[PDB]
C-alpha cells in the first residue's frame, strides 16, 4: 500500500513526506527526522531542482543508482527513497533517507591527537569501506575528514559531496587516468593526521601542496620518469634537485612501529606501488580488528549506463523506475 503523506513547510520549500517520518527539522536541501517504523534518527535529502537541466537529471539518476546499490556497514547506503507522486507525469520530486550520523571525522576529534588503538579502528573502518567501494570499480577521488560520517562510538561511514590537503599528487597535477590508490593517499594523509594531531600536507595552494609532498616522499624516482608521457612535466621533473625520501620514524616520533610501516606503503609517490585497500586490511597493524571472513565485496557496478546522452524525459523515466523498484534494508 502507498503510505499516507503530509504537507509541511520549513523554508521556501513544500516538503511532502510519509507519516513514518516525524519531528522534522531543517539542517542545511536536507532535513533531519525521526523514523517511527524503524526507531532510528534519519536525515532526509530532498533533491534540489531534480530535472532542471540534463545535468541535473543525470546527477539525480546517478546519485540514486549508486546509493541504491550501496550496502555496507562503513558506506552510506539507503534506508528509503520516496516520492509523493502516484505516476510518472506528476513525478517531479525525489527524497532520499539514510540514518543520521552525528558528526564528521573533523569534529569527533580532528582537533587533538588521538590514540593508536583509536586510529587503528578508525582507519580499519575506512579501509573496510574502501575495499567494498573499490571492488565496485569505483574511486572516491575526494576522500577527506569532512567526508567521513562518525557516530558517538567511532562507527565510520564514507560519503561524497582546505580541501586539496588530502588529494593525491597525480590529481593535483591532473594526469587524466588514475586508479583506486588515489584514495589510499587520502587515507595516509588522514591517518598521519590522526597520529600526530597535525595536518601532514598543510598546502596553501596547488604548488605548495605539491612541494610539501616531495619534501617527505622525495622527488620522482628514475623508474617513475618512464611513466610520465607529458614532455611538459617530464622535463620539469628532471630540472629539480633530487630529494631523498625522508625517514618516517623521525617524522612520526613515538608512533606505533607498525603504523609507521603502513604509512610508508600507503604514501608511495608512485600510485602503481601503493598498497591496495584489500592488502592494507591484512597488514599486521590491524590484527586486532581484521576479520578476513567479514570484509565483503560488492557486485560490479555499471558506470557506463549512467554516462549517456538522453533527453530530460528519458532520465525522468529511468529515475522513476528506480524509486518504484527500491526495496528497503532489513533490521
Ligand X SMILES: CCCCCCCCO[C@@H]1O[C@H](CO)[C@@H](O)[C@H](O)[C@H]1O
Cell numbers at residue 248, please? 618516517
Q: Does 43 bind ligand Z85 (CB under 6 A)?
A: yes
Q: Which of residues 54-113 bind ligand Z85 (CB under 6 A)?
A: 59, 62-63, 66-67, 70, 75-76, 96-98
- Cβ at position 238, least distance to ligand X in Å: 10
Q: Can you tell me which of 90, 160, 205, 223 binds ligand Z85, judged by CB under 6 A?
A: 160
- Measured from the CB atom, the residue of 167 and 213 that comes closer to ligand Z85 is 167
- Residue 218 is assigned to a ligand binding site: no
Question: Which one, 85 or 228, has the nearer CB to ligand X?
Answer: 228
Q: Give the nearest distance from C-beta 163 to ligand X in angstroms.
A: 19
- Is 302 a binding residue for ligand Z85 by CB under 6 A? The answer is no
- Nearer residue to ligand Z85 within complex by CB, 30 or 103: 30
Q: Which residues bind ligand X (CB under 6 A)?
A: 169-170, 173, 175, 177-179, 220, 224, 227, 237, 269-272
Q: 239 among the known binding-site residues?
A: no
Catalytic site includes residue 160: yes
Measured from the CB of residue 126, what is the shortest distance to ligand X in angstroms? 20
Q: How far is the CB of 127 from ligand Z85 (least distance, A)?
A: 14
Residue 298 binding result from ligand Z85, ligand X, none, given CB thresholds of 5 to 8 Å by partner type: none
* 268 known member of a binding site: no
Annotated catalytic residue within 117, 137, 160, 208: 160
**Which of ligand Z85, ligand X, none is residue 289 near (CB under 5 to 8 Å by kind)?**
none
Catalytically active residues, by annotation: 160
Amino acid at each position: 500500500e502507498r503510505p499516507t503523506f503530509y504537507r509541511q513547510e520549513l523554508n521556501k520549500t513544500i516538503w511532502e513526506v510519509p507519516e513514518r517520518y516525524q519531528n522534522l527539522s531543517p539542517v542545511g536541501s536536507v532535513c533531519a527526522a525521526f523514523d517511527t517504523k524503524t526507531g532510528l534518527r534519519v536525515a532526509v535529502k530532498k533533491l534540489s531542482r531534480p530535472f532542471q537541466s540534463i545535468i541535473h537529471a543525470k546527477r539525480t539518476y546517478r546519485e540514486l543508482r549508486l546509493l541504491k546499490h550501496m550496502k555496507h556497514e562503513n558506506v552510506i547506503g539507503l534506508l528509503d527513497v520516496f516520492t509523493p507522486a502516484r505516476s510518472l507525469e506528476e513525478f517531479n520530486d525525489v527524497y532520499l533517507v539514510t540514518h543520521l550520523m552525528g558528526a564528521d571525522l573533523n569534529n569527533i576529534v580532528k582537533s587533538q591527537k588521538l590514540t593508536d588503538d583509536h586510529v587503528q579502528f578508525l582507519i580499519y573502518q575506512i579501509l573496510r569501506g574502501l575495499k567494498y567501494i573499490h571492488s565496485a570499480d569505483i574511486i572516491h577521488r575526494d576522500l577527506k575528514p569532512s567526508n567521513l560520517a562518525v557516530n558517538e562510538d567511532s562507527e565510520l561511514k564514507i560519503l561524497d559531496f582546505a580541501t586539496r590537503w588530502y588529494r593525491a599528487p597525480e590529481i593535483m597535477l591532473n594526469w587524466m587516468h588514475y586508479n583506486q590508490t588515489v584514495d589510499i593517499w587520502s587515507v595516509g594523509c588522514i591517518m598521519a593526521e590522526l597520529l600526530t594531531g597535525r595536518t601532514l600536507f598543510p598546502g596553501t595552494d596547488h604548488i605548495d601542496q605539491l612541494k610539501l609532498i616531495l619534501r617527505l616522499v622525495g622527488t620522482p624516482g628514475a623508474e617513475l620518469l618512464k611513466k610520465i608521457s607529458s614532455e611538459s612535466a617530464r622535463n620539469y621533473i628532471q630540472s629539480l634537485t633530487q630529494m631523498p625520501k625522508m625517514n618516517f620514524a623521525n617524522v612520526f616520533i613515538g608512533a606505533n612501529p607498525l603504523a609507521v610501516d603502513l604509512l610508508e606503503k600507503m604514501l608511495v609517490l608512485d600510485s602503481d606501488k601503493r598498497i591496495t585497500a584489500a592488502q592494507a586490511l591484512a597488514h599486521a597493524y590491524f590484527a586486532q580488528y581484521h576479520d578476513p571472513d567479514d570484509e565483503p565485496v560488492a557486485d560490479p557496478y555499471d558506470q557506463s549506463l549512467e554516462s549517456r546522452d538522453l533527453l530530460i524525459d528519458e532520465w525522468k523515466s529511468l529515475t522513476y523506475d528506480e524509486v518504484i523498484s527500491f526495496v528497503p534494508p532489513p533490521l
